[PDB]
Design an enzyme around this catalytic site. Structure first.
Site, PDB file in Angstrom:
ATOM      1  N   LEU A  22      44.456  32.274  48.293  1.00  0.00           N
ATOM      2  CA  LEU A  22      45.682  32.691  47.624  1.00  0.00           C
ATOM      3  C   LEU A  22      46.076  34.120  47.977  1.00  0.00           C
ATOM      4  CD1 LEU A  22      45.073  31.077  44.073  1.00  0.00           C
ATOM      5  CD2 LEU A  22      46.647  30.310  45.890  1.00  0.00           C
ATOM      6  N   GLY A  23      45.118  35.038  48.040  1.00  0.00           N
ATOM      7  CA  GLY A  23      45.425  36.418  48.373  1.00  0.00           C
ATOM      8  C   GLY A  23      44.155  37.164  48.698  1.00  0.00           C
ATOM      9  N   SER A  24      44.331  38.358  49.256  1.00  0.00           N
ATOM     10  CA  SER A  24      43.199  39.222  49.578  1.00  0.00           C
ATOM     11  C   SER A  24      43.643  40.663  49.800  1.00  0.00           C
ATOM     12  CB  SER A  24      42.462  38.709  50.814  1.00  0.00           C
ATOM     13  OG  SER A  24      43.307  38.731  51.952  1.00  0.00           O
ATOM     14  N   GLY A  25      38.047  41.628  47.265  1.00  0.00           N
ATOM     15  CA  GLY A  25      39.111  41.092  46.434  1.00  0.00           C
ATOM     16  C   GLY A  25      39.829  39.891  47.026  1.00  0.00           C
ATOM     17  N   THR A  26      39.134  38.756  47.105  1.00  0.00           N
ATOM     18  CA  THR A  26      39.694  37.506  47.613  1.00  0.00           C
ATOM     19  C   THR A  26      39.757  36.472  46.494  1.00  0.00           C
ATOM     20  OG1 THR A  26      38.663  37.994  49.744  1.00  0.00           O
ATOM     21  CG2 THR A  26      39.562  35.789  49.432  1.00  0.00           C
ATOM     22  N   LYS A  46      37.526  33.855  42.304  1.00  0.00           N
ATOM     23  CA  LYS A  46      37.543  35.231  42.792  1.00  0.00           C
ATOM     24  C   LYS A  46      36.193  35.555  43.421  1.00  0.00           C
ATOM     25  CE  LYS A  46      37.982  38.765  40.019  1.00  0.00           C
ATOM     26  NZ  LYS A  46      38.865  38.784  38.814  1.00  0.00           N
ATOM     27  N   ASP A 133      44.265  48.844  32.246  1.00  0.00           N
ATOM     28  CA  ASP A 133      44.989  48.579  33.487  1.00  0.00           C
ATOM     29  C   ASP A 133      46.104  47.551  33.272  1.00  0.00           C
ATOM     30  OD1 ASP A 133      45.757  48.781  36.107  1.00  0.00           O
ATOM     31  OD2 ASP A 133      44.106  47.561  36.911  1.00  0.00           O
TER      32      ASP A 133
END
Ligand SMILES: *CCC(=O)N1CCCC[C@@H](n2c(NC(=O)c3cccc(C(F)(F)F)c3)nc3cccc(C)c32)C1
Length: 288
Positions: A22-24, A25-26, A46, A133
Site C-alpha cells: 500500500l505504501g512505504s 515504514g511499509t 505494517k 501526533d
C-alpha cells in the site's frame, strides 16, 4: 492505576496472505484467515532492536484501545520484521482523501469527520492517553462515513508529559510543547485544531513556505492559521479557541463533540461550499 488486562494476540504467519504493497515504514494489504473459522478479514500489515522495541510499544497502546473511532489492533506476527496487523482502511488516510476528492466533499462529511475525530480523542483522554501526533495524515478512512485515529507510536500514557529531543511535527504542536516539550490532552486539542484546518482547506499545508524554526516566534507574536474560505466565523472561532495560549482556555474534546454535533444538524449554515447540495469476508469491526 488499574490493571491493563488487554489481550495481545500472536498470529501465525501462515494465517494470512499479503496481496499488495500500500505504501512505504511499509504497509501491506492482506487477508487474515483464522484457521477453521471460515472468515476472511481484510487487514493492513505494517512490516534492528530499536525498530522492534518501538513497534512493540505501539502494539501495546493499540492493544489497550477499543473505540469505534480509534484504530484497531488485531494482533502481531513474530518474525524478524515483527508485523503489526490491523483493520484495513480501504480509503487510506484522510488527508490524501480530501486532497483527492475535494470537488465532491460536502459540509456534512466535513463536520461529521470533526465529530468522529473528537470522539476518538475524547476516548483516548478517558484512557489517559496523549496522542502527540494528531494530524489529518494520521486519520484513516474506513468508509467516507467512518474515520479512525491511527499512529500511536509517539503516544504516551499518564498530568503532563516531559519528553526528550526526538523529532516532532512543529506545525501541529501546541506552543507549550514547542518550547517546553510539555504535552497534555490540551496540547492534543491544539493539534485537533490544525487537523480541522487541514480538512476545511481540503488538505493545505499549515504555514506553507515557512521552516519549522520560525514557527515558535510566529505563534508568540500572535499569528495563527488563516480562516479557510468555506468556514463561517462559527467554525473558525472553534479552531482559534483550540489555539489559545492558556491551555485550559482551549476547548475539551467532549465540548468539541457537542459543538460540531450541533453544526452537523444544519451543515450548510456552518460551511459554505459551492455545489454542496470472497463470500466469507467479514469486517474486523464485526470479528470480536
Ligand atoms: C496519507 C498516507 C496514506 O494514505 N496511508 C498511510 C500509509 C500507507 C497506507 C495507506 N492505505 C491504507 N492503510 C491502512 O489500511 C492502514 C490501517 C491501519 C494502520 C495503518 C498505518 F498507520 F500503520 F499505516 C494503515 N489502506 C489503503 C487503501 C487504499 C489506498 C491506500 C493508499 C491505503 C494509507
Amino acid at each position: 492505576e488499574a490493571p491493563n488486562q488487554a489481550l495481545l494476540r500472536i498470529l501465525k504467519e501462515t494465517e494470512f496472505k499479503k496481496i499488495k504493497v500500500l505504501g512505504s515504514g511499509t504497509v501491506y494489504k492482506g487477508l487474515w484467515i483464522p484457521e477453521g473459522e471460515k472468515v476472511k478479514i481484510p487487514v493492513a500489515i505494517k512490516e534492528s532492536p530499536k525498530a522492534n522495541k518501538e513497534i512493540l510499544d505501539e502494539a501495546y497502546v493499540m492493544a489497550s484501545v477499543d473505540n469505534p473511532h480509534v484504530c484497531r489492533l488485531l494482533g502481531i506476527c513474530l518474525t524478524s520484521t515483527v508485523q503489526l496487523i490491523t483493520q484495513l482502511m480501504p480509503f487510506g488516510c484522510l488527508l490524501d482523501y480530501v486532497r483527492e476528492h475535494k470537488d465532491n466533499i460536502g459540509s456534512q462529511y466535513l463536520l461529521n469527520w470533526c465529530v468522529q475525530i473528537a470522539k476518538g480523542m475524547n476516548y483516548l483522554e478517558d484512557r489517559r492517553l496523549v496522542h502527540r501526533d494528531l494530524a489529518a495524515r494520521n486519520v484513516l478512512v474506513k468508509t467516507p462515513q467512518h474515520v479512525k485515529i491511527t499512529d500511536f507510536g509517539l503516544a504516551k500514557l499518564l498530568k503532563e508529559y516531559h519528553a526528550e529531543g526526538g523529532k516532532v511535527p512543529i506545525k501541529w504542536m501546541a506552543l507549550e510543547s514547542i518550547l517546553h516539550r510539555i504535552y497534555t490532552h490540551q496540547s492534543d486539542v491544539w493539534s485537533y485544531g490544525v487537523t480541522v484546518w487541514e480538512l476545511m482547506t481540503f488538505g493545505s499545508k499549515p504555514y506553507d513556505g515557512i521552516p519549522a524554526s520560525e514557527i515558535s516566534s510566529i505563534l508568540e507574536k500572535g499569528e495563527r492559521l488563516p480562516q479557510p474560505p468555506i468556514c463561517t466565523i462559527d467554525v473558525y472561532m472553534i479552531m482559534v479557541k483550540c489555539w489559545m495560549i492558556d491551555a485550559d482556555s482551549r476547548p475539551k474534546f467532549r465540548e468539541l463533540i457537542i459543538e460540531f454535533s450541533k453544526m452537523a444538524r444544519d451543515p450548510q449554515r456552518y460551511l459554505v461550499i459551492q455545489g454542496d447540495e470472497m463470500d466469507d469476508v467479514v469486517d474486523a469491526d464485526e470479528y470480536l
